[PDB]
Amino acid sequence: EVIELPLKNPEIFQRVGIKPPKGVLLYGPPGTGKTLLAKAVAATIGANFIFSPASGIVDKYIGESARIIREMFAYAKEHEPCIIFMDEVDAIGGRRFSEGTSADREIQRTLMELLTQMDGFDNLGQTKIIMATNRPDTLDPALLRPGRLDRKVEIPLPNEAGRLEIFKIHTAKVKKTGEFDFEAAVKMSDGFNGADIRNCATEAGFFAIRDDRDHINPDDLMKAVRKVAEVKKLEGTIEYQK
Amino acid sequence: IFIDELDAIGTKRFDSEKSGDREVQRTMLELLNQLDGFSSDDRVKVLAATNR
Amino acid sequence: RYDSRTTIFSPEGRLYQVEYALESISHAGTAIGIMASDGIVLAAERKVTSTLLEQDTSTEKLYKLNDKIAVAVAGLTADAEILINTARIHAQNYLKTYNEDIPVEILVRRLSDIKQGYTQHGGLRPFGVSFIYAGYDDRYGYQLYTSNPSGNYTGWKAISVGANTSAAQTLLQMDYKDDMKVDDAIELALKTLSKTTDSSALTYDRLEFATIRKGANDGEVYQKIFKPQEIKDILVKTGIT
Amino acid sequence: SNSGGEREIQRTMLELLNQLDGFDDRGDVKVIMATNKIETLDPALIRP
Amino acid sequence: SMSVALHRHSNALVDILPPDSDSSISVMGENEKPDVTYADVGGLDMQKQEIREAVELPLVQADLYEQIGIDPPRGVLLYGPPGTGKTMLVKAVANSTKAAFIRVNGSEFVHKYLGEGPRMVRDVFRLARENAPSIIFIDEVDSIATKRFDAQTGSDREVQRILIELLTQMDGFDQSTNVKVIMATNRADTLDPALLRPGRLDRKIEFPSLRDRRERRLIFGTIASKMSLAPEADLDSLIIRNDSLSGAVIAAIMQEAGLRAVRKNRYVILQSDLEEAYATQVKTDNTVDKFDFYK
Amino acid sequence: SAAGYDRHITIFSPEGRLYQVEYAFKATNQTNINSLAVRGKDCTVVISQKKVPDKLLDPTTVSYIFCISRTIGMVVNGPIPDARNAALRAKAEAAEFRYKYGYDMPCDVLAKRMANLSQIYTQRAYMRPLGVILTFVSVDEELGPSIYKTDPAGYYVGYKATATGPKQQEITTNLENHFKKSKIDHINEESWEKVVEFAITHMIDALGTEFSKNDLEVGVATKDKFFTLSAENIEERLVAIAEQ
Amino acid sequence: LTKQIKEIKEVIELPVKHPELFESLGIAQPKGVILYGPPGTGKTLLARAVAHHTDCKFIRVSGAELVQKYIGEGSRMVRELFVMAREHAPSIIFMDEIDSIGSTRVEGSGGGDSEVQRTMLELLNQLDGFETSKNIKIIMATNRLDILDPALLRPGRIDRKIEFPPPSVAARAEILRIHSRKMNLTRGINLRKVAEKMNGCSGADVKGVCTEAGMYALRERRIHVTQEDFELAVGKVMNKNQETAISVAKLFK
Amino acid sequence: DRYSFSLTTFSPSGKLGQIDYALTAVKQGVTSLGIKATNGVVIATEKKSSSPLAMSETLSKVSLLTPDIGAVYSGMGPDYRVLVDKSRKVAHTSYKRIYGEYPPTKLLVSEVAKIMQEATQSGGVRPFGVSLLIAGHDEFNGFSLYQVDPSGSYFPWKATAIGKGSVAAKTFLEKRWNDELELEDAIHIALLTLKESVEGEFNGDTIELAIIGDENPDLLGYTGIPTDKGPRFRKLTSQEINDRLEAL
Amino acid sequence: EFKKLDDKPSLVDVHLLESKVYHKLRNLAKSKASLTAARTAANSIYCPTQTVAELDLMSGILHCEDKDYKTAFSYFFESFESYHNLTTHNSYEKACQVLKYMLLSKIMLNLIDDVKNILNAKYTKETYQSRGIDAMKAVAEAYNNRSLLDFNTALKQYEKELM
Ligand SMILES: Nc1ncnc2c1ncn2[C@@H]1O[C@H](COP(=O)(O)OP(=O)(O)OP(=O)(O)O)[C@@H](O)[C@H]1O
Ligand SMILES: Nc1ncnc2c1ncn2[C@@H]1O[C@H](COP(=O)(O)OP(=O)(O)OP(=O)(O)O)[C@@H](O)[C@H]1O
Ligand SMILES: Nc1ncnc2c1ncn2[C@@H]1O[C@H](COP(=O)(O)OP(=O)(O)O)[C@@H](O)[C@H]1O
Ligand SMILES: [Mg+2]
Ligand SMILES: [Mg+2]
Ligand SMILES: [Mg+2]
């Protein structure tokens, strides 16, 4: 709604008499498919893609972040329609600082020049910004109120029947005899991310290749989901975030 | 291929001064893509080592 | 740093805790005690004032610890509270035991010992409170003291603690005369308090006052707190209001 | 702490200690080092 | 001392140039403002009347200031929580003064070398003189100015050096036909209150976020302008229920309502669409979830 | 962030928050059970999940509902060490009170004192918070059906009905729908059996998960007695619902 | 700020107009002044007034030196401070460095601190000199002494420290007098009122009320500035300070 | 800092960061206020429940310590109830053994305050999480009102507020307070001031309002002895509250 | 006599009375002055409700003649709220005048979308219904249609309300 329609047709918003909605905050847990979902919308339009970590511009060299965002937006203007994907705003998250060590103060600089750059000043034509982050809990108020922004999308853990659809995509790729045991599988696969479901297909197929069959059978899918569930909580702490 | 310490040709942190080891880091991705130049990665496999 | 506890000294053998505790006194308002031949006047300053604040139920920096010796208070008030009570109890312990009222020097000595004792042993905090003791005993007649938050005392004919200590001290001693009338003692207090204080209009509600006399009601040490309506008058004589 | 001088102090000091000792241990060219303290210099100089 | 042309082979002076080129740009975007509907004339006019008397008025008319015999004004400070329109107030006035608007940003002046940033700062004040009357604006002072001075690293001292340079020129030793520098911050805690200081920088205007129904009515008068909503849907029922909302929340409200119109494939916004908006992009409702032992 | 703070309970943050205490509101979901307590008009029911995940354990012993005293039940959500430990204090204060004052201790007074004791454990820094939610149920000898939930900080408030555990939000929503829709503050049955049945139904609705007698344990406080239903007693109830 | 006008005349003008008198009567010569106190007191403008009457060079050096590179570097323009001061003597140099750098680098040591340490320290060498004194009147300005670095602070290679006061009732009145002539003179005389009402915390407050009052008259479109204009004008500026500290009587010791 | 893990050492700038942070903790709490009259005291606070299922009807936030001395809080909810428990016991000790009945308002305030002082007096114990307002009546000093801070200091006031909306309530009270106010009139100021705190959730049943007024020999619990005075404290009911909010 | 005793709500009104006196003598330079005089001195805004309703009305009348009619409307609405939600003892008379004035400013802007918002059965055709309201809407529609002939018919019968 926010990105794809006004870029493709500005015209329908001219009729409604409002300005186009710009700005989305996407937040959720790692391996929840935030890159997937951001990438997906743009790819339809044919729009150019810019993936900039916000911790790869923080050096000890002060003003190193400022300089990099400056050129980044100006290139995007030529590569219109374009959506810049600001990956992590939790590495430049928060407002307080402006004191102590020079890294703390590097955050404010990055933030303060961006505010105008959103705001249209400057001027986002057929450029739109999609913001991705792990932590909306530590975010700047200036860069996270309304009117930076039109929809706050909370993306939880993949749904009870959302994981079922992820199993459909992955189980399509492989050669199999036809399997109908995902019903029990998805129930085993509670609290999992699409990254761990991805792993489960690959694992389920490694067992087939160890047993010397080129086919994914129901016996091996069951193994994948038990073993991943174990090794997921062993090296995890079951992290709590919004 | 056996690739030694990744604590110096592709640090996570950029609070290390690097400008050419920055470019080594970008080439480490290109290698993984090229192992799909035979399908999968079976023929040309990569092992890698890091100490942190 | 070596400010972690009282036990530990710096290279130079000073203790930072003592230093902080001195500075605590001057972050609460000016307090001035003047001794004169004909009485010792105490006057203090209100660090608080809100428009809905009341201060007519009590003086928050003046307590009588005995019927002959009273103290004006400078420092944090919670810290103050504990000690005001310890001193007054010790005073009457003397009265119970000897059937006469406590001499000034003992009373001060007791509280500086307790305060030092908190530095000398244990984990307990030092308690930064400076009391100006104004008393009468047959040893040296009127006597005006103050106690350090460093835990020792010094005799006086005038002393100022609380905010603007330097400012109060020179001004008081410039207009000091060895004799001094109790009316002039009052007049002086108000004049030095206005200059120090950043509230331009020194009103009676910014003032605490007592005058202590054995020259009034002879054979009897009599400490008398002025009421607001009396404080209100003297301000018009000094021409503030 | 940025740039433009990461090298200069490091080369310059080291190079000073070297040609003082390398003369020979002479008592005919004296040096005088005037300094605020040894806490603004390195903890070993060149070193008694 | 200024820029000049030398010929390439003679290596001798044959022509002269303005000093206005060979420096950094006078206006980062277009000289005339983008918004020509305005949301500054429509939106907080009251607050804007203060800003204009200091900024537009002395450059248009000298005669006005003369009459009292008072000299041109001191600097202007914009502060108040985000979503108060300070980025848009400053340029809405400037365009209608017919100044040409320095901005640049004070985030430019930061640099990774040494001694070059304070140089940029000195460069901007002279430059503003060369095209004066002009309205001088620095977009942030939230990082130029500080809570605590520091210099543990050299990189803290750089910040501190830019701070110094602002003030030193914002006396002016060669006067200004400009209004003195306009500045913007979010709060006054990232200002040194010692060093800004009336004198200097004297007009200080706090924009409210708490508002009154009059302040918010203006924001709607702007929205009624751009999309004149049906005579059936009531614009004024939305106002009465607002009690504590920013001009940025209001901006989103109208954005979200006419997004639901694109969805329904209409061409009008209705009072339903407003109520849907009224619920949402408000946040909170999460401080009751497990907490009740801090009440 | 962290700079001391969270390592202690006598250290406040800039915000005045005591962080370590908040960690016990995260430590009480560590058993993964969920509880439901509901009120009728002659009983309070309290129901918690029964996880017997290894058949190497005896399904009997498993429970977190403990009889504290004649008239008082309690459900524990969160850790087994802290379950027993809180039960010790509760059992003991209930007995001491009985003998001090000669008369039984109400749901509210047991709830009140447990919290204060916990508060003193937050005031001092040789103790720590017991990271459990305790939900006491009794039918009062003077105020009838009651539920008091005690939180690990030591807040206490009464309730009409309540839910606890990780999956609390869905149960909150169900229970809101129920009392709102009736416009009365209680379940309307005067047969305690159908209230236990009704409690069961709500619980299946809210969670989305059908149950078995190996996945429930049920406590029932009625006026002047308490009893925990055995597995075959629950079982009877489930076959009333499934075919009414 | 009368106290200050009298001092800076005795200290700066007398050794330059006649060096013979100061050496005959006293001994040595002062190396300069360290001006400190509240900001807003017009140290700089006062010092510019000194530079004009003595018939001395100016320059004024704004901030730390690194900034000029158009020929050479700013590290060596400190060395050239000597060469320039001497040839074009008689000079006054108003060397600036407010020291909002702070007390952090008064202790320090470490960081990029060594360059600005050098600029400040080597400047020091040229004045006192190793023979010859280039100029005797290089002049320091700063807000406090605790933020001032100790080589420079330590007297007897920099001389004289003069502290500006937050203005008296008397001072406020005299600052108020000179600008109000330029403005409009109130009928009934209410120039007396202003100084009674409040005493600023700096001399920038006294000037800032004057520019503000004639602002009030302007908006109404009236040439003269009344009693009334001054009454709003003192109030608006007082209100700013009062904001700051207000919760120091509720939830306080 | 390095004085804000310490419950012991002052700063060179005075006090503890821990007290200052305690004052913050107070300000996270709900808005409470009390207004003094010439024939009464009204006391008002708000109730939120964080679930409509919750029943904070049983909870009290305006709580009688003695029949002649009530109190409220702003700050941590558990810390209040214990500190109150101890207040009553210390109250029985200190003057219900001297006069054999409930203390003056002045006597109880300083003693309650003494309890706060002990949790600051000793390191390793944090101050109590709450600041109280204590209003009562005695005959030697009349109607009175107080704030008792966790610092161990206490202040007498005409009207005051504490809690989150404190700074707005404080200004309200200044103007609208008069040299003479009736009991009804403080009740009327109080409601308007509390409605600033929350709107769309404001009804007088979620608002707890009680008084310290005149003797009540109806809620005394005995009768036929006129040579005694009944409780100066009274809780007004939900309906009576509703009446005042209907009137406004 | 009482500038050395100014802090009263009494003399906020006295400054409002100058706006009225100077409004009628037909000079608005010195009404706008005394309007600011009342407002600054009415930073005691928790002093009585009536004072605050007069203050908004006076502001509106001036800005209405400043020819700012969106500003005119906002103060006018605010004056209205005061009367309607305050108790009635004379406030009924004042409420009616302000409803005409709301209509007055909006017709100048030549917007009939919002005039029609103001016309409703909850206070404009129910609690207050008056001949002067009907005069106003008759003018409004007449303005928009751009027929002076519709203006002419209206004014003859509604002159009383007008004047
Ligand atoms: N003067 C104004 N009053 C009301 N609303 C305004 C005004 N100017 C612009 N707006 C609306 O408010 C929105 C947000 O305001 P804007 O981004 O200009 O804020 P700011 O306070 O300068 O922000 P920041 O602190 O992020 O720099 C704009 O997108 C516009 O719709
Ligand atoms: N004594 C005075 N007589 C008249 N004007 C004064 C006086 N002192 C200060 N002012 C005025 O106050 C304003 C602020 O002073 P100025 O900026 O010159 O200060 P400074 O203390 O030298 O500053 P910095 O620390 O930024 O170097 C000026 O407008 C100046 O003209
Ligand atoms: N919801 C999902 N649907 C499909 N694949 C998923 C999903 N979520 C994650 N993945 C898989 O996990 C991998 C890594 O997750 P990524 O898309 O990089 O996430 P994030 O941006 O949340 O950190 C993806 O490349 C994809 O294989
Ligand atoms: Mg990603
Ligand atoms: Mg902005
Ligand atoms: Mg200066």
Swiss-Prot record, chain C:
- Glycyl lysine isopeptide (Lys-Gly) (interchain with G-Cter in ubiquitin) cross-link located where? K96, K195, K227
> Gene3D superfamilies under this entry?
Glutamine Phosphoribosylpyrophosphate, subunit 1, domain 1
Q: Which Cys-Cys disulphide bridges does the record give? A: none
UniProt GO cellular component terms: cytosol; nucleus; proteasome complex; proteasome core complex, alpha-subunit complex; proteasome storage granule
UniProtKB keywords = Cytoplasm, Isopeptide bond, Nucleus, Proteasome, Ubl conjugation
Q: Name one GO biological process term.
A: proteasome core complex assembly
| Alphabetized InterPro entries for the sequence | Ntn_hydrolases_N, Proteasome_alpha, Proteasome_alpha-type, Proteasome_asu_N, Proteasome_bsu_CS, Proteasome_sua/b
Predominant location category:
cytoplasm
Top-level lineage group: Eukaryota
Q: Does the keyword Cytoplasm apply?
A: yes
- What PROSITE patterns has UniProt attached to this entry? PROTEASOME_ALPHA_1, PROTEASOME_ALPHA_2
Sorted alphabetically, which SUPFAM superfamilies does this protein's record hold?
A: N-terminal nucleophile aminohydrolases (Ntn hydrolases)
Kindly list the places in or outside the cell where this protein is found, as annotated in its UniProt entry. Cytoplasm; Nucleus
Q: How does it assemble?
A: The 26S proteasome consists of a 20S proteasome core and two 19S regulatory subunits. The 20S proteasome core is composed of 28 subunits that are arranged in four stacked rings, resulting in a barrel-shaped structure. The two end rings are each formed by seven alpha subunits, and the two central rings are each formed by seven beta subunits. The catalytic chamber with the active sites is on the inside of the barrel.
* PANTHER family referenced in this protein's UniProt entry, alphabetically: PROTEASOME SUBUNIT ALPHA/BETA
Family note: Belongs to the peptidase T1A family.
Q: What else is known?
A: Present with 17100 molecules/cell in log phase SD medium.
Q: What is this protein called?
A: Proteasome subunit alpha type-3
Q: Which organism is it from?
A: Saccharomyces cerevisiae (strain ATCC 204508 / S288c) (Baker's yeast)
Its organism's taxonomic lineage begins at:
Eukaryota, Fungi, Dikarya, Ascomycota, Saccharomycotina
Q: Which gene is the coding source of this polypeptide chain?
A: PRE9
UniProtKB/Swiss-Prot annotation, chain G:
Which BP terms from GO are recorded? Answer: chromatin remodeling; nonfunctional rRNA decay; nucleotide-excision repair; positive regulation of RNA polymerase II transcription preinitiation complex assembly; positive regulation of transcription elongation by RNA polymerase II; proteasome regulatory particle assembly; proteasome-mediated ubiquitin-dependent protein catabolic process
UniProt KW keywords: Acetylation, ATP-binding, Cytoplasm, Nucleotide-binding, Nucleus, Proteasome
* Entry GO CC: nucleus; proteasome complex; proteasome regulatory particle, base subcomplex; proteasome storage granule
Give the record's PTM text.
N-acetylated by NAT1.
GO MF: ATP binding; ATP hydrolysis activity; proteasome-activating activity; protein domain specific binding; ubiquitin protein ligase binding
Binding-site residues, ATP? G37, P38, P39, G40, T41, G42, K43, T44
Q: Any idea where this protein resides?
A: Cytoplasm; Nucleus
* UniProt subunit comment: May form a homodimer or a heterodimer with a related family member. Interacts with OLA1, TMA17, and UBR1.
Function of the protein: The 26S proteasome is involved in the ATP-dependent degradation of ubiquitinated proteins. The regulatory (or ATPase) complex confers ATP dependency and substrate specificity to the 26S complex.
Q: What else does the entry mention about this protein? A: Present with 4700 molecules/cell in log phase SD medium.
The record's comment on protein family reads: Belongs to the AAA ATPase family.
- Official protein name in the record: 26S proteasome regulatory subunit 8 homolog
Per the UniProt record, the source organism is Saccharomyces cerevisiae (strain ATCC 204508 / S288c)
Which section of the whole protein is represented? Answer: 153 to 405 of 405
Curated annotation (Swiss-Prot), chain H:
- Point out the cross-link Glycyl lysine isopeptide (Lys-Gly) (interchain with G-Cter in ubiquitin) in this chain: K106
Which terms under GO biological process does the entry name?
proteasomal ubiquitin-independent protein catabolic process; proteasome-mediated ubiquitin-dependent protein catabolic process
Which chain regions cross the lipid bilayer?
A: none
Q: Quick check: keyword Ubl conjugation in the entry?
A: yes
Location in the cell reads: Cytoplasm; Nucleus
Looking up InterPro entries in the UniProt record yields: Ntn_hydrolases_N, Proteasome_alpha, Proteasome_alpha-type, Proteasome_asu_N, Proteasome_sua/b
Name the SMART domains on file. Answer: Proteasome_A_N
**GO annotations of cellular component type:** nucleus; proteasome complex; proteasome core complex, alpha-subunit complex; proteasome storage granule
Primary localisation category: cytoplasm
Give the UniProt keywords, A-Z. Answer: Cytoplasm, Isopeptide bond, Nucleus, Proteasome, Ubl conjugation
**Other information:** Present with 7060 molecules/cell in log phase SD medium.
| Similarity annotation | Belongs to the peptidase T1A family.
Function, as annotated, reads: The proteasome degrades poly-ubiquitinated proteins in the cytoplasm and in the nucleus. It is essential for the regulated turnover of proteins and for the removal of misfolded proteins. The proteasome is a multicatalytic proteinase complex that is characterized by its ability to cleave peptides with Arg, Phe, Tyr, Leu, and Glu adjacent to the leaving group at neutral or slightly basic pH. It has an ATP-dependent proteolytic activity.
Official protein name in the record? Proteasome subunit alpha type-2
Which organism is the protein's source? Saccharomyces cerevisiae (strain ATCC 204508 / S288c) (Baker's yeast)
UniProtKB/Swiss-Prot annotation, chain I:
The known PTMs are summarized as: N-acetylated by NAT1.
Q: Look up the coiled coil feature and give its residue ranges.
A: none
Q: Which family does it belong to?
A: Belongs to the proteasome subunit S9 family.
**Reported function:** Component of the lid subcomplex of the 26S proteasome, a multiprotein complex involved in the ATP-dependent degradation of ubiquitinated proteins. In the complex, RPN6 is required for proteasome assembly.
Extra facts: Present with 16800 molecules/cell in log phase SD medium.
Partners and quaternary state?
Answer: Component of the lid subcomplex of the 19S proteasome regulatory particle complex (also named PA700 complex). The 26S proteasome consists of a 20S proteasome core and two 19S regulatory subunits.
Q: What is the protein name stated in its UniProt record?
A: 26S proteasome regulatory subunit RPN6
| Organism of derivation | Saccharomyces cerevisiae (strain ATCC 204508 / S288c) (Baker's yeast)
